[PDB]
Write a protein that binds this ligand. Sequence first.
Ligand SMILES: *[C@@H]1O[C@H](CO[C@@H]2O[C@@H](C)[C@@H](O)[C@@H](O)[C@@H]2O)[C@@H](O[C@@H]2O[C@H](CO)[C@@H](O[C@@H]3O[C@H](CO[C@H]4O[C@H](CO)[C@@H](O)[C@H](O)[C@@H]4O)[C@@H](O)[C@H](O[C@H]4O[C@H](CO)[C@@H](O)[C@H](O)[C@@H]4O)[C@@H]3O)[C@H](O)[C@H]2NC(C)=O)[C@H](O[C@@H]2O[C@@H](C)[C@@H](O)[C@@H](O)[C@@H]2O)[C@H]1NC(C)=O
Ligand SMILES: *[C@@H]1O[C@H](CO[C@@H]2O[C@@H](C)[C@@H](O)[C@@H](O)[C@@H]2O)[C@@H](O[C@@H]2O[C@H](CO)[C@@H](O)[C@H](O)[C@H]2NC(C)=O)[C@H](O)[C@H]1NC(C)=O
Ligand SMILES: CCCCCCCCCCCCC/C=C/[C@@H](O)[C@@H](N)CO[C@@H]1O[C@H](CO)[C@H](O)[C@H](OS(=O)(=O)O)[C@H]1O
Ligand SMILES: [Cl-]
Ligand SMILES: [Cl-]
Ligand SMILES: [Cl-]
Lengths: 99, 280
Amino acid sequence: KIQRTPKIQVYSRHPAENGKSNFLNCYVSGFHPSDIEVDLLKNGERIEKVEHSDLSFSKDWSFYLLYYTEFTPTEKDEYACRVNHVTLSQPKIVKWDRD
Amino acid sequence: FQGPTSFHVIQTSSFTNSTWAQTQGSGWLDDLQIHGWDSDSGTAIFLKPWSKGNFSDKEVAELEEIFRVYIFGFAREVQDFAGDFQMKYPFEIQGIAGCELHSGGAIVSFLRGALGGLDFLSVKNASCVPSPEGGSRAQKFCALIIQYQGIMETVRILLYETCPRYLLGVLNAGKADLQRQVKPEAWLSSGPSPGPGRLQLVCHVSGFYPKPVWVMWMRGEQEQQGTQLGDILPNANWTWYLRATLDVADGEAAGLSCRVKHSSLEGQDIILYWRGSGLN
Ligand SMILES: *[C@@H]1O[C@H](CO[C@@H]2O[C@@H](C)[C@@H](O)[C@@H](O)[C@@H]2O)[C@@H](O[C@@H]2O[C@H](CO)[C@@H](O[C@@H]3O[C@H](CO[C@H]4O[C@H](CO)[C@@H](O)[C@H](O)[C@@H]4O)[C@@H](O)[C@H](O[C@H]4O[C@H](CO)[C@@H](O)[C@H](O)[C@@H]4O)[C@@H]3O)[C@H](O)[C@H]2NC(C)=O)[C@H](O[C@@H]2O[C@@H](C)[C@@H](O)[C@@H](O)[C@@H]2O)[C@H]1NC(C)=O
Ligand SMILES: *[C@@H]1O[C@H](CO[C@@H]2O[C@@H](C)[C@@H](O)[C@@H](O)[C@@H]2O)[C@@H](O[C@@H]2O[C@H](CO)[C@@H](O)[C@H](O)[C@H]2NC(C)=O)[C@H](O)[C@H]1NC(C)=O
Ligand SMILES: CCCCCCCCCCCCC/C=C/[C@@H](O)[C@@H](N)CO[C@@H]1O[C@H](CO)[C@H](O)[C@H](OS(=O)(=O)O)[C@H]1O
Ligand SMILES: [Cl-]
Ligand SMILES: [Cl-]
Ligand SMILES: [Cl-]
């Protein structure tokens, strides 16, 4: 069986305004099998209070999950989504980009 | 009526080895989740107060028990026959079943199963149909399953008699959430440059419900055919996010705008104007 690697899309719920509480979303999709590990990161470090959806899959049987948490964007702070999957030899990191 | 028109349950059964398998399940209206499956208790989690539709507590419990027995027996029998079906661990099986309401009022039901992320079987006319991707293994499975007493009759009843009345009852019971209208917000950004001397403009649209939406880059009243819609992405709490991008030559971005149309807006489109020279 051919395994599918995760697509990773990072986006804020609201336009980023420095110092205004917001929501950071990481959508992980297109992958197979379903076993996966997803963290949201702040300046490389793991964020502890992160929520996520129950497992689902698309019409082509690829799995997808939403991870999200509250955050307050600043100018200097960096946020990212780090994913591990059997298809990846090392964790894949996708940083959030307001522009 | 707006909002979802279908109900389905999904199964993901993960077989690590001959002695260890685990199943996750959930129930959905289109892609809105309304049921969870709690493996701690072998019972459902009802995510909305109306998630039982018009079904009585008694029937809901009976269905939970059907699913709990099915979940256990499915894993048991898959492990017992894995040798005869020449299965190599680990492997993962998926299933989806439910029904949907079409224009004209017909309700059509479906059941699909997958092995290794590829179609394996479907149920047509209350019959097991092997998919070609599933090969002889799927032909073997279908010929075996229809001999287990009562499985096929339970599937037929659940698909063609329980699902349609459940769907209608829950679409009605949840209409305050399912047919609500949530206005989007929109904003503009200057996204990843396509290449030399060129720009990508990005119109973001976030927080709308229901899902259908219209976003287009415009020069005055002329819709730019170059507009590229990204995929609709979920937000938490049953709203959606969408990007529409436009790749434009450096000195041709002036004069562009983004127009958003959505059922919630009562005909008052959102219009954002791109301004040159870093004036947002
Ligand atoms: C949950 O809701 C379901 C849907 O209810 C309707 O929609 C919701 C949104 C609300 O508006 C409700 O107020 C509304 O009722 C219920 O299922 C529906 O139940 C009704 C009975 O109440 C049933 O109507 C009967 O239909 C048959 C014909 O059905 C066949 O033919 C049609 C095509 O014409 C086909 O679509 C069907 O699939 C069948 O093949 C008809 O003969 C009946 O007539 C008899 O009764 C009426 C009065 O009811 C009388 O005037 C006649 O003279 C005659 O005696 C009657 O019209 C709907 O078909 C059914 N819809 C579906 C999709 O199944 C559901 O009710 C429960 O299930 C039903 C199947 C039935 O056993 C009920 O007794 C049950 O309570 C309800 N509850 C649950 C737990 O599901
Ligand atoms: C069969 O598998 C179980 C469980 O495997 C673990 O969980 C899976 C979901 C997968 O992610 C695997 O990589 C995991 O290892 C094995 O159970 C383990 O057994 C050892 C020895 O007793 C124990 O130290 C571990 O903690 C156990 N893990 C769990 C979750 O119970 C089991 O040994 C395997 N059996 C065979 C014959 O290989
Ligand atoms: C809780 C509210 C949600 C309401 C859901 C109603 C919508 C119906 C959804 C359609 C789902 C149809 C797909 C189901 C597949 C299996 O459940 C089906 N194959 C059941 O067969 C079961 O298999 C087991 C043995 O392996 C048990 O025998 C099951 O239960 S029994 O007590 O009746 O014996 C027996 O019915
Ligand atoms: Cl980071
Ligand atoms: Cl269980
Ligand atoms: Cl159990």
